[PDB]
Each structure stands twice: as structure tokens, then as C-alpha cells.
Symmetry: C2
Subunit: 475 residues, 2 copies
């Protein structure tokens, strides 16, 4: 026998009419990709006539991207689709009642780099609106990043509050997280696998049907709604633990006086699917939101659903431990620099520190949740002047970034490399010795961009993360 949802869905036929709420970095390529598909009729992108965002309706309704910025193929694609009557931007949210599938791709901000919980108000709004206008036989996919259990929890509860209908009876609900990078938007979508999880089999197939058409090389990875949200968190939690594994090897190697890079490359010689080890690079910390928060969401997720967990006792989980080792890396950089100044008898209080790197990703502009900030704070509290350099980061809240190397390195007692920028990989000992003066300048390298022998030979007191065996060198 067929269940109630299955009847309704086969009774709808296929998906012809798609709606995308959230006209930002992620919902625009989505809506437009949906619309560029042969087998779909219209897609409606929903955007309220805000004084902040109303201009998106007119920019988009004419084939133009409201964003920053160039994003290869994007402007072009929107144009392609606006012309054919297959894409329209609207503030009329009561449309939605006319759709087969509705998707929510609303940005999920964060107040301050305020620890764990992003702000969801914009998203919950989208969901209320969906619920207000939701009809039986509709497919609703949450595409925003959400914390495990949101689909089966609140998202379901408000969607059912608003409509009087039941998820998995009157309508389908799924989650399809969008793993995506600005710059490579359209084709990352196109080219890699999409995770798709409904609250039931009926909902996951209805979604497979949504996402299949947009893919050229990517496949859909079908699963449950919760399994999908946990996949987002787990992918970050695991990369985090990989980083914390080598950071810890780095610390172990320093105490043993050996080079972590040689141990790393020995480990790395083990190749093969299910064999590798997949060893990452050690460094001066971990920045971003995902890598620094997703284990807490996975752990909160275990807690919120009150399923029965057995685990060794009541302690910390390796993931939490990974968070803490990774979090310690800035203070470790600092102990290194204090140690380096000590070899000369030089304090900190009233030292100049030239910090090289605010962003934490090589040749990039995001300093969000930067390991550089906890480091700056330790230097400032201990009594040092600090000047900061980064050739990409433009304007950061209440901290001065100079683009002028040299202005930054002038009179510096210590030069501290926190970001693996290309510019720092071309930093020559000669120049740094001559612009900082001093007589023994200190250089602390947290990103494997300094060749130690060049600097040591130049009068520098060198330290490097995980370095032998370099750190107790003669000057």
C-alpha cells in the first residue's frame, strides 16, 4: 500500500515549479542553476522589498548579479535565464503556494565572531513564510547550514505551526547542505557530490529529483535529514582533528628536538585508499567558523536528541581535545617568541613585534576567527607594541592592518609569521635584518614559509612550529 505523502507526490507529477528564498551568495547560483535546467518551468527567488535588499529584485530582474562580484559565469547565467521567463525575483511570498518544491538558502550570519551559535532569525523568517503559504504535496528543502536535528526539530515544528499540515504526510522535508566556495560557485555545485537527506524515503527521493538535474559530474548522495546535517559537521570535525593530530606531533617533536616535517613526510610515504593517513600541515592555529565550531554542534546535537550514548566515561571527547590543542597553538606561538627573546635576555614588555599575517588562509582576505587575534592579545597584555601586516585584509573591526611591509618590520625586536602568504615566502633574511636593525632580530615562523638556515646564518634567533632541532641553534 501507498502512504499519504507518496500518493500526493505521484499525484503532483514531477517538479516543475521551484522557489528559492535567500538571494545571496548561495541562493542565486542555486535558483539560476535550477532555472537553467530543461526539465523545470519557472523558478521564483523570493526577496522582500527591504531598504537594505530591495535593489536585488530590480538588479536580478534584469539579468545582473547584485554581489561582490565577478564570480565566473554567474552574471552571464542569470542573464541566460531572466530572458527565457524561467527566472523571476519576487517579494510576494504568498507565491510559494504555487510551487512544487521550495528551497531555503538564507545566510546564517553570527553576531560577533560570537562563539558558537550563528544568528538564525533571517532563516526562521524564511521558514515561517514557507509554512504560512505551504500546501499539501510540496517539497521543502532547507539548504542553509543548520545544527544537527534542526530539520526534524524546530524547522518541522514551525513549518507545522504555520500550516496545520504534517511533515511526512501532507508534505516532504529534506535538508541539502551546500558545500560551496565563492569564486568557484557554479561549477562546485555542478561538479561535486550533493548530500540530500529527507525525513523519510518519500522526501529523500523527492529531493534527489530536485538536485539531480543540476549536476554535471556530481552525484547526489541520498540519506536521512539528520544524517545529512551530521555529515556537514563531521566533515569539519574530522579535518579539525587531523590538524590537531599534527599540531600535537609538532609539539612532541619540539620537546624531542626533531623536525616534524621529516616525520610528517615519512608518515606521508604511506599511500593508498584506506591506507594514507592523510597527514595535514601544522600551523599557528585554526580560523573560520566551521573548523572551530562544528564539533560543538555535533556534540550539542548528540545531547539535544537525548539518544542513549555509551562512551568510556564522562570526560572530553577527542574532538573537544582537538578543539583545545588547536586553540592552544596561538599561545604556543607566543611562548616561542618569549623563549626567543629570552635567548638574548629581552622580556616582551616594550618590545616591538612585527606580525606577518592577519588572514589565516594563504593569499586570502578572511580573518574571521583568526588565530592571529589571540596572539596579538597576549603580546599587548604583556607590554609589547604590535604592528600588523597583511597584503589582503583591508578593513578589520578595531585593528590596524598595514599593507606596507617594512613600515611593519622597522625597529621590530621579533618578526612573527602567522599566515602562509606568498609574500612571506619571499621574505629574505638580509632585508629583514636591515629593516629591523637590532643585531639579533627574532623570527618566529608558524606557517613553514621561512627557511631557517638562511636566517640563522644572518644573526637571527629562529623558532619554527615543530622545528627540530632548529630552536636550540647557535646564533
Amino acid at each position: 500500500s501507498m502512504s499519504k505523502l507518496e500518493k500526493l507526490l505521484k499525484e503532483r507529477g514531477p517538479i516543475k515549479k521551484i522557489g528559492v528564498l535567500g538571494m545571496g551568495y548561495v541562493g542565486i547560483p542555486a535558483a539560476v542553476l535550477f532555472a537553467d535546467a530543461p526539465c523545470f518551468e519557472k523558478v521564483l527567488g523570493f526577496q522582500r522589498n527591504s531598504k537594505s535588499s530591495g535593489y536585488k529584485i530590480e538588479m536580478l530582474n534584469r539579468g545582473e548579479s547584485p554581489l561582490k562580484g565577478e564570480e565566473p559565469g554567474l552574471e552571464e547565467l542569470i542573464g541566460k535565464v531572466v530572458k527565457a521567463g524561467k527566472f523571476e525575483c519576487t517579494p510576494d511570498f504568498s507565491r510559494i503556494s504555487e510551487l512544487d518544491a521550495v528551497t531555503l538558502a538564507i545566510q546564517t550570519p553570527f553576531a560577533n565572531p560570537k562563539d558558537l551559535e550563528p544568528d538564525f532569525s533571517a532563516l526562521i523568517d524564511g521558514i515561517r513564510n514557507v509554512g504560512k503559504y505551504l500546501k499539501p504535496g510540496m517539497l521543502v528543502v532547507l539548504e542553509s547550514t543548520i545544527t544537527p536535528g534542526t530539520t526534524e526539530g524546530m524547522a518541522k515544528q514551525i513549518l507545522e505551526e504555520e500550516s496545520g499540515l504534517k511533515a511526512g504526510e501532507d508534505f516532504a522535508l529534506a535538508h541539502a547542505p551546500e558545500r560551496v566556495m565563492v569564486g568557484r560557485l557554479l561549477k562546485n555545485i555542478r561538479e561535486h557530490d550533493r548530500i540530500v537527506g529527507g525525513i523519510d524515503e518519500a522526501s529523500t527521493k523527492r529531493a534527489v529529483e530536485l538536485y539531480s538535474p543540476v549536476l554535471t559530474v556530481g552525484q547526489v548522495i541520498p540519506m536521512s535529514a539528520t544524517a545529512a546535517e551530521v555529515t556537514k559537521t563531521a566533515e569539519n570535525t574530522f579535518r579539525d582533528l587531523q590538524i590537531a593530530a599534527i599540531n600535537q606531533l609538532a609539539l612532541y617533536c619540539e620537546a624531542m628536538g626533531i623536525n616534524v616535517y621529516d616525520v610528517r613526510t615519512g608518515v606521508d610515504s604511506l599511500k593508498g585508499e584506506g591506507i594514507t593517513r592523510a597527514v595535514l600541515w601544522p600551523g599557528a592555529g585554526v580560523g573560520g567558523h566551521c573548523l572551530t565550531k562544528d564539533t560543538y554542534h555535533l556534540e550539542r546535537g548528540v545531547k539535544i536528541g537525548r539518544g542513549e550514548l555509551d562512551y568510556p566515561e564522562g570526560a572530553d571527547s577527542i574532538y573537544v581535545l582537538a578543539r583545545k590543542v588547536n586553540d592552544f597553538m596561538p599561545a604556543h606561538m607566543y611562548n616561542l617568541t618569549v623563549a626567543a627573546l629570552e635567548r638574548l635576555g629581552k622580556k616582551m614588555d616594550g618590545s616591538k613585534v612585527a606580525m606577518l599575517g592577519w588572514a589565516f588562509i594563504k593569499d586570502s582576505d578572511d580573518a574571521r576567527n583568526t588565530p592571529s587575534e589571540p596572539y596579538r592579545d597576549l603580546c599587548l597584555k604583556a607590554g609589547a607594541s604590535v604592528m600588523v601586516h597583511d597584503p589582503y585584509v583591508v578593513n578589520y573591526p578595531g585593528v590596524e592592518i598595514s599593507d606596507n611591509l617594512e613600515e611593519v618590520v622597522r625597529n621590530a625586536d621579533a618578526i612573527v609569521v602567522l599566515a602562509g602568504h606568498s609574500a612571506y615566502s619571499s621574505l629574505k633574511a638580509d632585508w629583514a635584518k636591515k629593516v629591523s636593525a637590532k643585531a639579533n632580530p627574532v623570527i618566529i615562523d608558524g606557517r613553514n614559509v621561512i627557511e631557517p638556515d638562511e636566517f640563522i646564518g644572518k644573526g637571527f634567533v629562529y623558532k619554527g612550529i615543530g622545528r627540530e632541532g632548529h630552536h636550540h641553534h647557535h646564533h
Copy 2:
């Protein structure tokens, strides 16, 4: 500006006469690979008349090997090298004196009762013999698997006490471990990159020369001796950690009623390199020597030297807590089997358990530290009777294992799978149901070989590591 050792070395010239001590599974291929390398002149292999092993002298000198057929080039390699007069086995250790380099490739087997350190007695006997006949400018290489700190610690003390000369001044000292397996000896040594670590740069470079000519495809990875020793522990540690990682996610997935394998395939859709999370497979536990013991070696290792470890306050080494996750899995298997009997109103006591699988690798004959042992022990204490099956493992000490599945499974309350043997992947629901007799027989899967729906539909009560969402199945 040349060092003393460097001079002796340039004055001795290129390596021409090589010695291998340890005519065992590894030292015979090694010695015999060296002797085949044009560029080397003559290799000596060193054997006592250990009544028991005395014979190898004469066997080898006719051109023959030991037990079980190897890389069926081994005997032909010996024949070739012996015929060309480039290899000879001798009981006369005094001839170490005649050599440019000597290698210690002595089985470091034990044990016998296992853990925590190997039985180095034969190894240390060899080093003594080496020390005893050591001459200035010779190179000594540890090829046997050792623990961090052995080369710079006891290996050199013995070498130094016996000879009365100094390592890194009078003679060169290195560590070149191999990862090798029987049946694959010749190509492992040739195609596997070879970690070679000297106690100083001079010994490293001398040792690279010893090993470059037998590599064909493999490459030499040069580092410090101590870094070499750490490399092998780090490879097991990092693997052990990847296992504790998924095992852990499996516990979390159980709590959330979701499938670990969907999470895992989701995660694994991120493709490397430097990107892959290289996700392994969760299970009933970790066995072996290396994987279970190495991280205790790193731990001790971090503390043997002069050097301060900077680590966050309170702590727990990530690796130490990997060992505990993985040590827990037998107890987790046990809780799942108890839980499955609860569903029926049965208790471990008085119930019969059929252990399918005593080895821990899919189709292996070895149960060195089987996670099946602590599991078997939990059942026996709770008052259950136990029958153990395994197609391969014969003669476990003080523990009786059986060939025939039927007798093991007949009348059993719980069927519990701990090795992924192929026999268990072919296990069909009907058969286990009837042989167990029962009505609602219990099957618990530690190795992802049992298809849940087949067994659930046939009346079973099912549990598998990290299984949804199959474990709360109506039966």
C-alpha cells in the same frame, strides 16, 4: 672545516664491503639485495652455529633460503649472488672488522607473552658483536624495529662501551627501519620509500649511500635517527587515531538514530590531496602490536630527552584518548548484545553466545591482541556460555576455537560478529535462524558484514556498530 667523521669517511671512500647481522626473514633479502647491487663488492651475512640455525650457513652458501617460499626470487637471488661470489654467510663475527658498513636486521620478535616492549635480547647481542669489532670510519645501521630513543640511547652506549670509540666522530650511526611483509619481501624493500636517519648529517649521508642502490622506484627519505624511530610510531598512532575517530562517530550516530555509513560516504566524498579526510571503518576494536602499543612509546619518547613539552593545561594527549576509544569497542559490543537481549526479556547469564570471528582482519590467521578476547571475557563473567568460531585461527593459548559454524551457532541466544571473514558475509538469515533455533535470535555485527533487513525480516533482533536507526527496529 671538515669534521673528524667526515674525513674518515672521505678517506675510507665509497661503501664497498657490507655486513648483515640477522639471517632471518628480513636480513636475508636485505643482505642479498645489497650483494646484487653492482657498485657493492661483497656482503657478509652473520650467523652463529645456534644449534637450531647453524645449518643456514651451509644452506645459504649453496644458494638456498628458509621456511615457506618467498617472493619466488629469493632463492634465485641467493643463487645468483652466491654464484657471483658477492655473498657469503659466516659464524665469524671478527670479520665485521673488514667492512665499510654493517647492518643489524635482527628479528625483534617478542613477547613471548606480548607487550609493552619487544624482546631485544638477540638484537642487543648483535650490537655487542658489532661494537666488539667496530673500526674507525665504519657505518652501523639499525634496521630492526626499535622504540624512540634506542639509537641515541642504548644502541650507541653498547657500541661505545664495546669498541671504546665515539659515535658521530669515530664511526657513523643510522636507523633504517622497514615496513615489509612475507611473500612481498623483495619488492617491499625495493619499492617502498626507505626512512634513513643518521645521528648527525654525516651518518645520514653515509647511510643514504648504503640504501640508494637497492631502491628501484622506492626513494630514500633522509632525516635524524630519532626522527626515523618516531616515524614508525607516528604512522601507527595516526592510523590508530583515524580508527578511534570513526569509531567515535559510530557511537554518536547510534545516539542520533542515524547510519554511520551514510555519514561516512558523505564525508568521504571530499577528494584529496591535502583535502581527503581519509575516513576508515568503525568496528569491534583494534588488534595487533604496533597499533595498540606505539602511542605509549611516543608518550614515553616525548619525556626521555632534554626539552620542555608545551601542551595545553590539563590535557590528555589526543593519542592516549584514541587508545581508550578503541579499547572501549569490545565493551560497546558487549552493551549492544546485552541491549539486544533486553528487547526480548533475556539476560546475558545462562544465555549462549556464538562468537563469529577470533582473528581481527578479514580472513587472517592471527589473533595477536584480538579485541575478541576482552569481549569473550565480559560474557563469561556475566554468566553466559561461549563458543568461538574462526575458519583460520588454530591453537590459541588457553582458549578453544572451532572450524564448524553449525556447532558454534546451534542453540545460540546471540550471534556476534567480530571479524569480517568472508564466511560471515555469506551467512544467510534462514540458516542462522534455524541452527540457533529460537524464534527471535539475536545477531550483533561488529564488522559491517550482515545486511540488516534480511535478518530483521526473518525475526532477528539486530545491532551493528553505528547502525541508525537499525537498532531500534520493530521486530
